[PDB]
Symmetry: C4
Subunit: 301 residues, 4 copies
């Protein structure tokens, strides 16, 4: 009966999104593609490695199916080899290449029991090559499988519109962080992208912006549900941030969150940018506003 | 006959906790749960991944049992398939589905020897699917096993009450670090959580506190048994730290310790927070106090 | 129909280098060698580990061939053992050691089906040792395979000559970054190596140079195609950088780029140094210059 | 014919230590022990994990032998089970438990061919349990094997006595770095341990020392063979470093070196401390002194 840990016995957690589950996934910067990145498209030699990338993302149901497809294709190739013209391997329950398929599945996977017919050395060599390849394939598939597990998932990026509301008599901006996975130790850094008035982009196009203020007062260590926030009044590029000026430039607000996961420690980072028109007025100050009386932590979308 | 390394030939090390071993484990922030974090409960789609989490923590005896249970269940499902209605696979030592169980165990695991009866193609297809699934399962189990080993253990968090005692004519606070595993290179950072007097929590609720002082004079590199300590007299929020004031706010002292393990290098971190009432008066100054005359390092609880 | 992601449906990406693909790879700091580093050559005990290194780099086609070669060699050694002089294992389809080869391949890899002849205990012991070794070998090969995948590729180093051109009425230097793989979050640090005029190298030979300026105004977070740049006019060693002076010293410009890959997070770094004569005059200011009207991102060499 | 890379075609690299190879290894902080650390000895529950540690260090020849020993022991236990009293499994080439050993090796490892005798269900259950355990064991052994490879080796710590020699008319201290493996990107930090004159150790015993000066002018990025160095003349605790004073305290000089390996990126660190009497006078200024005329890099001990 701990204060927070008793929470899971509460009502269903489906409030994040029950209905959208049946709807397709959030594909916006992660749509099905053979590219790793839109800029990465330039490398042409990458075609081999593209498969690696492909096998890494959609792989939950697709990988198993893909592996099965590869199995069938590879096995049939073997069957064709069986028909090559050396003394054939027969005496399998199904006559013809079907029989070849039947014993060869055992070879390209594990190893055949009563299919004791390596009568011809040519057939044997073919089978031997298949054995080597098949065990190699198993290692490859297992390696890929582990690699997929190794890849962590960063749902921490979330998606929410920035809100510019006053706080402490000072104009400020606020961003919603995500607690979707094991988020317990993240820290964040804010980057902004403003274009100068004179930025015809013939010179130092795209002025990089250092806005440490979003995280400066906000250093988030008790990350169980922190919000990031900067102050406008100080000396910062954001002073002149009126909407029209922001619109003129390609004002982009970028926030990155990264830290250990408490789980096997990997530094998981997240990238999320919001457009200048994604900023919202102070009217959003109403916030989530807990509906349950008392200090309670609730997650609703 | 080195100075410290001769120590293991001394008396039993059981002083950390011999009797408590039979008692249940320290479940306080790590109780058996299907949640990853109390906040993480909100994500509902996580149910699949919950199993991953589950298989990662309690897994020492439970994993093997679980795997066996899965084996039995999966195998019996196969047996049911054997009874599907195609020409059945018989001619196994035990008649009936028991025989099916007997040969199928070989298929869903490794591969059957004298159970050379893939007489019917329908039976064969069923067996083939089982073979594919079984080898996949082996890869999955091995992957999970390695992943578990990959997860490091951080006993370094320990548990001890803070002590506010005077030192060098200056009021200070002290925290006991843990040397439970391979702790040789950790470094630490201190975070505090104070509530403002005016913190009705309608504004910037929960004032984050930067208290680098705990580690500031204490940078711990010779980590073989270091204690962390801050100074109150300087300008710090802790100046006004009288107990009544601390009680009013939800004064929380948080200390994190992290560094390489000398072992395959992973950055292992630890999180441990102590309540404001977990702070103890200066009377704790007596310390462990070595009982063995001379400079000796002893670990007793 | 996103702004950048629609790009892959454009023309072929082969512009990075279609013809050079048939030409040998860029071997300059990575030529075929048994050394790990030119300085690493000094360690002689490393000969065993040299193989590890060797198996890690060229391994795409070479590893499979090497493994096959090892298989043949190891298997033949087993065959020799078969001929040791204990009662021989015969009754294999091919008489003689060929038969030994035939059944032994099954033993040193997976396990033999109808080769049920462990008639002599001496033969059996030999086979048993082979079984143990073979399964160990499989584990070793799979481990090496995964390790290779674990190794990331850093094409991000690229190769381009530095350009010293004026910008904003201030003399500056510019370096081309690479987007060849998944480069999305890199950051960079600049190091320089100048020799003092008086540097007879009898004292503090080789004055290390701190040139943070290359990245100082350039902190690259929107890394989709950033260029690094320092300023000469400020107080920096580069003020006196006239070509003759640079030539006198062994002026070396070193830039390192590193950051998370968004992929399983590993910190991938890159090292690339350019000679003092690799610096080019301001005439290179023409830049790539997009040929497609409008703001477009194109990758051409 | 590159400048440094042609070096390996030179004379033998054995100069690091040809004869000492036959001599036992440098066991000083890494002697055969069941402890992870001298302080780690305190945890008693660690006994299980001690084996993990043990299997990780000496494992090059020992692991294979250990595994074989475990195989024999586990297999014999199975044989005992065969003799349990259920209808026995006979009809193996060797009569008695020897036969049991013979077929059981196939079960606890891979899977038996002509040993088609699971005649009794009790025998079968025993064999089945063995199959499950054996495959699990294989996974465990492979996991351990990969884990060992994952562990990097840091020979970079080296061992050399500090030298306090004058440089640039300023008293300085110098330390020899090691290039033994793939050392290309390390950086270093210096820590010192001095005891105060008044340090009866009743107060803040052991004054931690921040000596960033060793690396301050020395930031080592061109790490192909850099030496670390601090300056005494500035304000530093080292000003009063006369030998007698150092002797009074337990002056310890600690230097840590860490950075990416260019190899699969792991941050490999190294810890090495030197006693106050390990410091040497300025007479060591003679240095290695290259014997080969011209600027050449040679590694001799």
């Amino acid at each position: 009966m701990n204060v927070d840990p008793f929470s899971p016995h509460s009502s269903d957690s489906f409030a994040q999104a029950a209905s959208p589950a049946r709807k397709p996934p959030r594909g916006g910067r992660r749509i099905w593609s053979g590219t790793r990145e839109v800029i990465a498209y330039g490398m042409p030699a990458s075609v081999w490695r593209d498969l690696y990338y492909w096998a890494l993302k959609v792989s939950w149901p697709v990988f198993f199916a893909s592996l099965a497809a590869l199995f069938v294709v590879n096995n049939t190739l073997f069957a064709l080899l069986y028909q090559l013209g050396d003394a054939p391997i027969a005496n399998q329950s199904p006559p013809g290449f079907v029989g070849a398929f039947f014993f060869s599945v055992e070879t390209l996977a594990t190893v055949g029991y009563g299919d004791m017919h390596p009568q011809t050395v040519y057939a044997h060599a073919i089978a031997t090559l298949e054995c080597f390849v098949g065990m190699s394939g198993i290692a490859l598939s297992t390696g890929l499988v582990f690699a997929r597990f190794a890849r962590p998932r960063a749902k921490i990026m979330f998606a929410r519109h920035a809100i510019v509301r006053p706080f402490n008599g000072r104009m400020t901006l606020m961003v919603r962080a995500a607690n979707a996975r094991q988020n317990v130790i993240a820290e964040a850094r804010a980057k902004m992208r403003l274009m100068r008035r004179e930025h015809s982009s013939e010179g130092y196009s795209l002025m990089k912006i250092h806005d440490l203020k979003l995280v400066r007062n906000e250093h988030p260590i008790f990350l169980l549900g922190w919000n990031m926030m900067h102050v406008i009044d100080e000396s910062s590029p954001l002073f002149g941030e009126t909407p029209e000026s922001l619109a003129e430039g390609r004002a982009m607000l970028l926030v990155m969150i990264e830290g250990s996961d408490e789980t096997t420690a990997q530094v998981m980072q997240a990238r999320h940018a919001w457009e200048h028109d994604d900023i919202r007025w102070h009217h959003r100050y109403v916030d989530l506003m807990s509906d349950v009386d008392g200090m309670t932590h609730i997650d609703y979308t």
